[model samples]
Target: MYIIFRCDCGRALYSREGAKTRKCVCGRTVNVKDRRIFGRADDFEEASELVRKLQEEKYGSCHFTNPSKRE
Candidate 1:
């Protein structure tokens, strides 16, 4: 399983369930256990999708007509 979390720099990141640490793009070290996990997924692909959604939620959507998967 994969888990999604955010960094102090406001970047969304993901790590495997067994990981002890995750390095954020902002160069901060995160201990997986201490992270305030925001979401979980069964695979990296879905994990990334969740992360992208979170990023857009915080940073503003890149697309104007983004009527994304709402079925």
Candidate 2:
């Protein structure tokens, strides 16, 4: 199973390894295992938009070691 962590910059961070200090878009090392990164907005669209921006151009359905599961 993988873990998803939230950043202050409205970014969700996930890592299989569960890094103690993961780099967030807000330039903060956030712990991917412990973050309240969900619920800034009330809707998938808003959440996805934030995810798209924070995720940069790496938006896809592929699962990586950091976060995301390939389907």
Report each candidate's C-alpha RMSD, comma-separated, in the order given: 5.3, 12.5
Q: Model 2, stretches more than 4 Å misplaced?
A: 33-71
User: Candidate 1 — which pairs collide?
Assistant: none
Candidate 2, residue 33: lDDT? 34
Query: Compared with the true structure, what per-residue lDDT tens digits does model 1 show for residues 22-52?
Result: 7765568654435545677788789989888
Local distance difference test, per candidate? Answer: 0.67, 0.49
State the lDDT of candidate 2 residue by residue for 1-71, as single tens digits. Answer: 23445565545655543345568554576544345443243454565564455453565555554454342
Top candidate (lDDT): 1
What is the model-wide C-alpha lDDT for candidate 2?
Answer: 0.49
- The per-residue C-alpha lDDT of model 1 at residue 65 equals 54
Would you estimate the TM-scores of all the predictions? 0.57, 0.33
Lowest summed lDDT across 10 adjacent residues in model 1 is found at: 62-71
**Deviation of model 2 at 38, angstroms:** 8.3
